[PDB]
Amino acid sequence: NNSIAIPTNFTISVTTEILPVSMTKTSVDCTMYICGDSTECSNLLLQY
Amino acid sequence: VVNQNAQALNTLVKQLSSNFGAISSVLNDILSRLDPPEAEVQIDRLIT
Numbered sequence: 001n002n003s004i005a006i007p008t009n010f011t012i013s014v015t016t017e018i019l020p021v022s023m024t025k026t027s028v029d030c031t032m033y034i035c036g037d038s039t040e041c042s043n044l045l046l047q048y
Numbered sequence: 049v050v051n052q053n054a055q056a057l058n059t060l061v062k063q064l065s066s067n068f069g070a071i072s073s074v075l076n077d078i079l080s081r082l083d084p085p086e087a088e089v090q091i092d093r094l095i096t
């Protein structure tokens with residue numbers, strides 16, 4: 001109740017914080033991806 | 049955000065016009081013009 005601890009010195013530390021801000025901007029085209037270079041699969045896709 | 053919600057609703061109701069590979073998008077005509085054991089397959093495809 002009558003005692004306090006007081007620092008007589010100090011240390012200047014440096015801490016590394018790594019934060020991701022973005023991801024790869026990947027683009028996928030449906031018509032090419034699910035239906036490869038064929039018209040009939042594209043006609044079946046148009047029903048979807 | 050208002051436009052995104054409106055576009056989502058518009059696409060959702062436009063998806064009813066889609067056939068999803070069924071003979072027609074409209075449920076009533078395909079139910080009327082098809083016998084039970086193939087109409088149910090078409091109805092299931094539309095429901096999926």
Ligand SMILES: *[C@@H]1O[C@H](CO)[C@@H](O)[C@H](O)[C@H]1NC(C)=O
Nearest residue numbers: 006007008009010011012013
């Ligand atoms: C404080 O600590 C540093 C090392 O971090 C030391 O060089 C310095 O002499 C210290 N000072 C006192 C007053 O103890």
